[PDB]
Amino acid sequence: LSLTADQMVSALLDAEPPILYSESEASMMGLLTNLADRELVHMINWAKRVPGFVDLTLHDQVHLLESAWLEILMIGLVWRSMEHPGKLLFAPNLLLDRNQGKGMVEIFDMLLATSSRFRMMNLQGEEFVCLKSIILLNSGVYTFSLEEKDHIHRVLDKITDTLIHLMAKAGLTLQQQHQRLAQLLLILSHIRHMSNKGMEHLYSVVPSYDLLLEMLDA
Amino acid sequence: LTADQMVSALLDAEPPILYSEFSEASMMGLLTNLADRELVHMINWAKRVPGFVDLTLHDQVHLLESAWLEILMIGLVWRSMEHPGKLLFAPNLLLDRNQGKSVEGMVEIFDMLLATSSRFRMMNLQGEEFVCLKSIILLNSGVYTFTLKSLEEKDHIHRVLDKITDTLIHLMAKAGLTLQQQHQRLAQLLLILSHIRHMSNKGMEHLYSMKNVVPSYDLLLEMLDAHR
Ligand SMILES: CCN1CC[C@H](Oc2ccc([C@@H]3c4ccc(O)cc4CC4(CC4)N3C(=O)c3ccccc3)cc2)C1
Ligand SMILES: CCN1CC[C@H](Oc2ccc([C@@H]3c4ccc(O)cc4CC4(CC4)N3C(=O)c3ccccc3)cc2)C1
């Protein structure tokens, strides 16, 4: 909460998790499930390095991860796929196009369109890691103590300050800084929608509290 | 449009507060009837949101198909803002969460609505901010799920969303917030739109679990597609 915007960016950039590799349709879904399961462990490690996260109770950290993990998996997929129009880069050895998706193809198309939007806004890495932290802190805050929510709101305020700082350094006018901040946060409501539809697809499943708690390694 | 002209147009577009036409058995019937009547006024409101009628009728329908439940829910939260623990579906239909326990799955959504109302209250959300947020929902909700014409439409929607951002900022500056406070408040408002998107998805699931579940394409087209 005392970190400068430069130090917040550096912390987030240093916390970035690694890109993992993948290990017919049936084998395709098994591969994707296994990849997501391995990514989750790295996601927990990443979350523990987001400044402010571990000041929350363990119970609240678990709730935030429960609400956010699918959104975080999807935004990372969208980021990896930016430079690959029309395809989704699940892993460096697992690049799929829309035809391989043929309720899969509707979510596949939403993800491709998000990656398209990122590509047209020329989303930067520094902006991406702030967006990912906002998903972690924002997604479960409405659905939980009041001190905990205050702390989460103070951290979100710091990430907003950091996003604005990055845009100012890139030379954006104040008007362009506000407009870009808004454009980026409006994409998060589309990522929320995808995660909701993504969950509906998966149930047609979630990591348990105990599993998340164990990976947090109190 | 200037920011002040944008606010004025949105305030003048605001639909009226409707009334319900009581027992737990009749509750879903009253709510359905109320929402059906609200949808008609929502259509008239959307046509008055600057830039909306520049779109094709097809795209207008698609935005309303994406956004209509979010828009009903945000109005409900706004009407309930000053009534802690209650949802003011209508001035004569004010429910608490024990009344939501009647239908399976209802209390979960009721609690999400109550938490949003509580958040609006904690932020002291102003009416001018509210109408901006509702217009953002209409323009943003269906834009990621829409070809030369499509590119032109998306560019136009993003330009109108940028104008509403400038309007939100102007409202906060004219009220004397600092630049830091302006950016922080803008972010806090827009992040609430993710929760509203979440509530609308859970709500749609709830509506299908009961099962005329949504306004059809042609119904929306019919109401949007007016003659002269
Ligand atoms: C941790 C929870 N359990 C373990 C995993 C199970 O959930 C899963 C979670 C994620 C996926 C993949 C996956 C993998 C890696 C990634 O980076 C991202 C994704 C994205 C994603 C979610 C949309 N997905 C799909 O397949 C998909 C993509 C396009 C259209 C339709 C579907 C599979 C299963 C339960
Ligand atoms: C236009 C479509 N038809 C309309 C009827 C069908 O959709 C409907 C749309 C809305 C509702 C109400 C309703 C009414 C007015 C309002 O301002 C807001 C709402 C909100 C709401 C949606 C969550 N709701 C519920 O009951 C509810 C409230 C609390 C918890 C769980 C459920 C009923 C039915 C198809």
- B35 and B160 in contact (C-beta within 8 Å)? no
Round to whole Å and give the CA distance between A179 and B182. Answer: 12
Contact A181 B187 (CB under 8 A): yes
HEC per residue, chain B: CCHHHHHHHHHHHCCCCCCCCCCCCCHHHHHHHHHHHHHHHHHHHHHCCCCHHHCCHHHHHHHHHHHHHHHHHHHHHHHHCCCCCEEEEECCEEEECCHHHHCCCHHHHHHHHHHHHHHHHHHCCCHHHHHHHHHHHHHHCCHHHCCHHHHHHHHHHHHHHHHHHHHHHHHHHHCCCCHHHHHHHHHHHHHHHHHHHHHHHHHHHHHHHHCCCCCCHHHHHHHHCCCC
Dihedral of alpha carbons B193, B198, B202, B204, sign? positive
Which residues on B lie below 8 Å from A110 (Cβ)?
Answer: 144-145
| Resolution of the model in angstroms | 1.8
Instruction: Return the CATH class of domain A5-216.
Output: mainly alpha
Structure tokens at A197: 């539809």
- Residue showing tokens 């362009």: A176
Amino acid, single-letter form, for residue A187: I
Task: Indicate if ligand 2 lies below 6 Å from the C-beta of B89.
Answer: yes
Q: How far is the CA of B222 from the centre of ligand 1 (A)?
A: 39
- A114 and A187 in contact (C-beta within 8 Å)? yes
Atom of ligand 1 nearest to the CA of A194: 23
Contact A181 B193 (CB under 8 A): no
Nearest by CB to B184, from A139, A157, A192: name it.
A157
Q: How far is the CA of A199 from the centre of ligand 2 (A)?
A: 22
CA distance B217 to chain A (A): 18
Q: Ramachandran region of residue B128, left (φ > 0), alpha (ψ -120 to 50) or beta? A: alpha
- In sequence order, what DSSP letters do the residues of chain A get, joined into one string? ----HHHHHHHHHHTPPPPPPP--HHHHHHHHHHHHHHHHHHHHHHHHTSTTGGGS-HHHHHHHHHHHHHHHHHHHHHHHHTTSTTEEEEETTEEEEHHHH--HHHHHHHHHHHHHHHHHHT--HHHHHHHHHHHHHHTTGGG--HHHHHHHHHHHHHHHHHHHHHHHHTT--HHHHHHHHHHHHHHHHHHHHHHHHHHHHHH-----HHHHHHHH--
- Is A49 exposed, middle or buried, given 0-12, 13-18 or 19+ CB atoms closer than 10 A? middle
Q: Closest Cα to residue B111, out of A197, A62, A135, A144?
A: A144
Structure tokens at A173: 């006018």
Radius of gyration of chain A (CA): 17
The closest residue, in CA terms, to atom 1 on ligand 1 is: A37
- A177 and B168 in contact (C-beta within 8 Å)? no
CATH of B3-224, one of 1.10.565.10, 3.40.50.261, 1.10.1270.20, 3.40.630.30: 1.10.565.10
Q: Closest Cα to residue A88, out of A17, A32, A34, A25?
A: A32
- B64 and B138 in contact (C-beta within 8 Å)? yes
Q: A200: annotated binding-site residue?
A: no
Write the CB contacts of B222 (distance below 8 Å, at least 6 apart in sequence).
Answer: none
Q: What angle do CA A98, A35, A122 make, to 5 degrees?
A: 55
End-to-end Cα distance, chain A:
22
Dihedral of alpha carbons B224, B225, B226, B228, sign? positive
Structure tokens at B76: 């409900």
**Residue to substitute in B72, B103, B137, B208 for testing ligand 2 pocket (most ligand atoms within 8 angstroms of CB):** B72
Residue A108 has a CB neighbour count (10 Å cut-off) of 19
Write the CB contacts of A101 (distance below 8 Å, at least 6 apart in sequence).
Answer: A107, A108, A109
Q: What angle do CA A19, A71, A40 make, to 5 degrees?
A: 45
Q: How far is the CA of B118 from the centre of ligand 2 (A)?
A: 20
Round to whole Å and give the CA distance between B121 and B83. Answer: 10
- Is B177 exposed, middle or buried, given 0-12, 13-18 or 19+ CB atoms closer than 10 A? middle
Dihedral of alpha carbons B185, A130, B197, B163, sign? positive
Q: What angle do CA B120, B136, B220 make, to 5 degrees?
A: 115
Round to whole Å and give the CA distance between B139 and B153. Answer: 11
Contact A178 B198 (CB under 8 A): no
Round to whole Å and give the CA distance between B191 and B170. Answer: 19
- Residue showing tokens 């589309």: A190
Taking CA atoms, A72 is separated from A12, A98, A131, A167, A195, in Å, by 14, 21, 10, 23, 9
Round to whole Å and give the CA distance between B64 and B42. Answer: 9
Structure tokens at A128: 């991406």
Round to whole Å and give the CA distance between A20 and A26. Answer: 21
Q: Quick one: angle between helices A25-48 and A58-81, nearest 10?
A: 130
Residue A33 has a CB neighbour count (10 Å cut-off) of 11
Locate the domains of chain A by residue range: 5-216
Nearest by CB to A143, from B115, B144, B184: name it.
B115
Between strands A94-97 and B93-96, the pairing is: unpaired
Task: Indicate if ligand 1 lies below 6 Å from the C-beta of A111.
Answer: yes
The closest residue, in CA terms, to atom 24 on ligand 1 is: A32
Round to whole Å and give the CA distance between B86 and B111. Answer: 10
Radius of gyration of chain B (CA): 18
Rounded to 5 degrees, φ, ψ at B83 are -135, 75
Write the CB contacts of A200 (distance below 8 Å, at least 6 apart in sequence).
Answer: A103, B201, B205
Round to whole Å and give the CA distance between A20 and B35. Answer: 48
- B200 and B70 in contact (C-beta within 8 Å)? yes
Which ligand number lies closest to the CA of residue A73? Answer: 1
- B201 and A193 in contact (C-beta within 8 Å)? yes
Rounded to the nearest angstrom, the gap between the alpha carbon of residue B25 and the centroid of all alpha carbons in its chain is 27
Task: Indicate if ligand 2 lies below 6 Å from the C-beta of B39.
Answer: yes
Task: Indicate if ligand 2 lies below 6 Å from the C-beta of B106.
Answer: yes
Q: Closest Cα to residue A132, out of A157, A156, A166?
A: A156
Which residues on A lie below 8 Å from B198 (Cβ)?
Answer: 142, 192, 196
Output b/e per residue, B24-44; b: 16+ Cβ within 10 A.
Answer: eeebeebeeebbeebbeebbe
Structure tokens at B222: 């019919």
Contact A134 B183 (CB under 8 A): no
Q: What is the dihedral of CA A93, A96, A101, A103, to 10 degrees?
A: 80
